[PDB]
Every structure is written in C-alpha cells, then in structure tokens.
Design a protein around this ligand. Sequence first.
Ligand SMILES: *[C@@H]1O[C@H](CO[C@@H]2O[C@@H](C)[C@@H](O)[C@@H](O)[C@@H]2O)[C@@H](O)[C@H](O)[C@H]1NC(C)=O
Ligand SMILES: *[C@@H]1O[C@H](CO[C@@H]2O[C@@H](C)[C@@H](O)[C@@H](O)[C@@H]2O)[C@@H](O)[C@H](O)[C@H]1NC(C)=O
Lengths: 162, 162
Amino acid sequence: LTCDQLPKAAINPIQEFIDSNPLEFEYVLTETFECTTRIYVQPARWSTTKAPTALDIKGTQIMAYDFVGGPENSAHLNECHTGDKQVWYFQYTNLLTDNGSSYCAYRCNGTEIIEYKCASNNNGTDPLQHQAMEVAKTVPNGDKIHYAKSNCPETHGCFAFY
Amino acid sequence: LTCDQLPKAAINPIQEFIDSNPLEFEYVLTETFECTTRIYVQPARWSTTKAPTALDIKGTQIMAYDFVGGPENSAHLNECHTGDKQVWYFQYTNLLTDNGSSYCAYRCNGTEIIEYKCASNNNGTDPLQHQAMEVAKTVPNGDKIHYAKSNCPETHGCFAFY
Ligand SMILES: *[C@@H]1O[C@H](CO[C@@H]2O[C@@H](C)[C@@H](O)[C@@H](O)[C@@H]2O)[C@@H](O)[C@H](O)[C@H]1NC(C)=O
Ligand SMILES: *[C@@H]1O[C@H](CO[C@@H]2O[C@@H](C)[C@@H](O)[C@@H](O)[C@@H]2O)[C@@H](O)[C@H](O)[C@H]1NC(C)=O
C-alpha cells in the first residue's frame, strides 16, 4: 500500500467539525502535532474567501490554516502566518456519535506519507481510529506514526489547553 | 463614574458566543490584546468542570482561559498556562444581529479599570460599541483605552489570523 492509495473519505459539513470542538490528536507523524488541540472555526463575516479555519494549538503556540475543498475529497490548507499550502485527505471520519467524534487525516508526498493527524474528543476510544492508524503505518514512511500524548506538560486548571 | 459602577450586563448563553466566532478586538486597554482574535470553545467532553474556554489569539501566540459564571453576571477566568484567575464583566452584549455581534467587557481593580476588551465581527460598526467605549474611558485609568488595530501585521491569505 502507498499513500496515494489510502482512502479519500467524504468530508463532513463544516458544522459537524465545529460541533466536535475541542479535539486532541492521538496519533501523529512528526513531533510538530504532539500534545496538540484542534479547533475548527467558521469563516469570518469579513472573509472574502469564506473559508473556515483549522487551529492547531500546542500550549501557548498556535498554527492556523484557512481551508477550502478541492478535488477528490481534498482539503486545501493555507497556513495563515507563512502562506504555505498543504493538501490533506481523510482516511475516515466518525463525527457526533454517542461516544463522541474521531477522524484520521493524512498528507502525502506522492507514494510516501509526510504528516498524519488522528484526532478525537473521546481519548482515542473509537475502534476505527486504532484500525486506521494500523493501515497508515503500512505506507512508505508510515513507520514514523506514533502516540501524540506520551509526555505532555502538566495542566494548570484547564483540560484542552496548557 | 468608577469601574465598580459600570453596568454588569446579562451574559448570553455560551452557544451565542460560539456562533459569533471569530471576533476581533476593536478597543483595548493595555497593548496585550491589540491585533487579537477571540474564539469561544465549548467544554471538552473529558472536562470535569465542563467550563467553556475563551481563546485570545495574537498571531502565532495564544492565551486560553477556561471560564465559569460567578455572582452578579461575572465571568471567572482561569488562564490555562499560568493558572492566574481573573474576574470580568460585560458592559453590554449585542450578539447575533443582522449586522453581526459585538460586546464590551472589562476587568476592574476596585474603582479603576485594568483591562478592557471590546470585540466584534462587524469591524466596530455597532453604535453601542463606540458608545460603551466612551463611557469606559471616564472611569479611573480608562484614559488608556485605545484602538486595537492601528498597526497589525500583514496577512498571508487568511482573514482572522496572521
Ligand atoms: C486516555 O488514554 C490513556 C491510555 O491510552 C492508551 O495507552 C497509551 C500509552 C496509548 O498507547 C494509547 O493509544 C492507548 O489507548 C490513559 O493513560 C489516560 O488515563 C486516558 N485518559 C482519560 C481516561 O481521561
Ligand atoms: C474597518 O474600519 C476601519 C476604520 O475604522 C475607523 O477608523 C479607525 C482608525 C478607528 O478609529 C475605528 O474605531 C474607526 O471605526 C477601516 O480602516 C477598515 O478598512 C475597515 N475594515 C473593513 C471595511 O473591512
């Protein structure tokens, strides 16, 4: 299996992602998105693109990306500080169940995987999530995929932020 | 007029604030919340307090505060990185109108004002907002209140983030 052959699942309407806030990453590829909370935001009233925004929050640092849909169930992200463009797909989504929400998303460079983000608001208890992670690890460079919460900073009274 | 005598307006249900996302500050007291976007987040499914969270995002930096209601229409904030406690009130709110949402909130130390946050998603065009700002400037230390967006960094393709 190569990264280009992973499923490209249907993307839920944006409101279903917003209604899942806040999410934390369970499995990630690089160190970048360890100990990170994901927040979805609807478009600003003054936005001329009317693109929603994804926020990746790691302690007191934040990456933001406006995003729009592209071909074949892609998400086209524009990182708000750098202008860097990224193309993402979803392996699966399972939002707004009786046990909460989960999904796994990935970023390829051709046949190899270069980033991976499995998110949930149920501490990774959706059986689909571990299953998806086990599939993604089989594509080239998927060996890097690992648990995102092994060594996070101590909290100071909150639950999705530190 | 002193800070303790400012109105303590009724606080809208949390969903009305979330539905107003994203907001930007129009008038602020210190430099801290210049060029800042405010995002409201519902409580995490795993939160034992079930407190919602306010995010103050300034470029790639973020302050987060879980908050709960207190006496006399107060909001009791817990800054998520430091554990520092803050007590806020609203001068007024005007959410989810045909021209969007605005509010002005303030933090006193007795008779003086120590922080001020007027937010909107309509670029400060609610007449109530300039009116409220003019009242707040009349309390001790209110002279510091000023426009929050005079010199913000250039964007890189987004609208509420940079
Ligand atoms: C969240 O789950 C944690 C255990 O997760 C499991 O073990 C870690 C090391 C990973 O391999 C992960 O994929 C496994 O599912 C608990 O330590 C923690 O207490 C849980 N949090 C709760 C219940 O709030
Ligand atoms: C947003 O409004 C800006 C003008 O705002 C006015 O002037 C500044 C200096 C402050 O005094 C403020 O309180 C006033 O309301 C415009 O420069 C800007 O283009 C507007 N943005 C829009 C239309 O998207």
